[PDB]
Amino acid sequence: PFTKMTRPSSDLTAFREHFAKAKHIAIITGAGVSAESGVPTFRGPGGFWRKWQAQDLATPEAFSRDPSLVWEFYHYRREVMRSKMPNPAHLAIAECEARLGQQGRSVVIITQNIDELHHRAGSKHVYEIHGSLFKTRCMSCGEVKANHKSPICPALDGKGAPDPNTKEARIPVELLPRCERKSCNGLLRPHVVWFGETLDSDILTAVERELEKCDLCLVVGTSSIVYPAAMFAPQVASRGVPVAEFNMECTPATQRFKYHFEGPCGSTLPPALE
Ligand SMILES: [Zn+2]
Questions:
Q1: 153 is in an annotated binding site
Q2: 247: annotated binding-site residue?
């Protein structure tokens, strides 16, 4: 007899049968998908920046309290992201999307990442549900612009260093990134969702619908801790739709899915998307 496990199947063959006949694939992604591009995640070494956990600084009170510190933090991340490049897991998702579109089959990417590496990969049908490290939003007027400038403002040049006893830059509020609209000159915030802030209503509305129409769901490189994203694949599996996790470890959501493929997703995902 089998001893009870809450580890789903690892049978690639059985998954690839579902993949062969699937018309609307929803692929959900977290930081794990960029791990092999050399971009740190929230669990390992990159969970910490100076004396804070990354989640501590991605908060409205943090910005309210020390806008300069929070801008240092996001400036560090923008600069780290700059060099990095799509790994074979990103590109396989783009290729899969390309190929299957010609046969009228849809592949939608719903990413928690704010690194735009799916866009740089060639993926086209993408919801960035937590915004983007390379967009600004104005605190007064609300303009969302892309912004890939190194550095976003001269005052941040050479700053944002991660070490815990690094000297604070204490940039005055007027010398932080400012809205380029003359006659507003408001303080910019990065255009990302912070813990305690609602996701964009139209994006989420659209994502719910994509999830309702999907007949197969992939969940790659996410810890499934941050809600609401964490409950997406769970809700799909609540409709009897097969879900397959691609992760180095188990998550508290793995239990609810049909398949689970342990390992670095740059290796496990491309053979599953062929
Ligand atoms: Zn403005």
A1: no
A2: yes
CA distances from 173 to 65, 178, 186 (A): 11, 9, 10
Q: Which of 243, 213, 216 is nearest to 21 (CA)?
A: 216
- Which residues are known to be catalytic? 130
| Alpha carbon distance 99, 107 (integer Å) | 10
- For residues 183 and 179, give the distance between their C-alpha atoms in angstroms, rounded to a whole number: 9
Q: Alpha-carbon distance 245 to 264, whole Å?
A: 12
- Residue 131 β-bridge partners: 192
Resolution of the determined structure in angstroms stands at: 2.4
**What is each CA distance from 106 to 6, 97, 126, 246, in whole angstroms?**
31, 7, 12, 20
Q: Which domains does the chain have, with CATH numbers?
A: 1-39+85-128+198-274 (3.40.50.1220), 40-84+129-197 (3.30.1600.10)
CA of 130 to the centre of ligand 1 (A): 21
